Amino acid sequence: MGSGPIDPKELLKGLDSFLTRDGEVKSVDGIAKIFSLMKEARKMVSRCTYLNIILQTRAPEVLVKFIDVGGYKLLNSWLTYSKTTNNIPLLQQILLTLQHLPLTVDHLKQNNTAKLVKQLSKSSEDEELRKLASVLVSDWMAVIRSQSGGGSGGGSDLDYDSVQPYFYCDEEEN
């Protein structure tokens, strides 16, 4: 193959000028223009580029208002949209971006994304997606255990059933 492809990243990286030079976040104005254009989500590169910027968005107020302005529904939307094709570098970035923002038990339960990410960190055919998903669900179950009152867990010898505090799907096959 003497012919080469085309760079699709620069098309979405034109917006990176409206963020900081490291591609983190400029302002609450910055997240909103990104929000509307990444919402379209019709390019695979638009997915990975903007989600990486929201990941590098180290301003926690910008994250909680991202959830507020519609990003909450869009996290579940893009999760399902990526799970159809099951694109490994995409799935792991979506769950890592919502791992970056402070998400509540109300949220993960309502959108059912708690179940969707937990079945990944139970047994998927890939290391990197489920180990990032494992850090995410361990963060979530730390919060959930703290909302419950307490519990040991330990960390080691800790089984897939004993890491289900509000992840218990009581679907009785019995």
From Swiss-Prot:
Its job: Substrate-recognition component of the PNUTS-PP1 protein phosphatase complex, a protein phosphatase 1 (PP1) complex that promotes RNA polymerase II transcription pause-release, allowing transcription elongation. Promoter-proximal pausing by RNA polymerase II is a transcription halt following transcription initiation but prior to elongation, which acts as a checkpoint to control that transcripts are favorably configured for transcriptional elongation.
Q: What is this protein called?
A: Serine/threonine-protein phosphatase 1 regulatory subunit 10
The major lineage groups are:
Eukaryota, Metazoa, Chordata, Craniata, Vertebrata
Subunit structure as annotated in this protein's UniProt entry: Component of the PNUTS-PP1 complex (also named PTW/PP1 complex), composed of PPP1R10/PNUTS, TOX4, WDR82, and PPP1CA (or PPP1CB or PPP1CC).
Q: Where is the TFIIS N-terminal domain?
A: 73-147
Cystine crosslinks: none
Query: Superkingdom of the source?
Result: Eukaryota
Subcellular location, record wording: Nucleus; Chromosome
Question: Domain text from the record?
Answer: The TFIIS N-terminal domain specifically recognizes disordered sequences in protein substrates that are then dephosphorylated by PPP1CA (or PPP1CB or PPP1CC).
Which organism does this sequence originate in? Rattus norvegicus (Rat)
Instruction: Give the UniProt tissue specificity note.
Output: Expressed in testis, brain and intestine (at protein level). Highly expressed in testis.
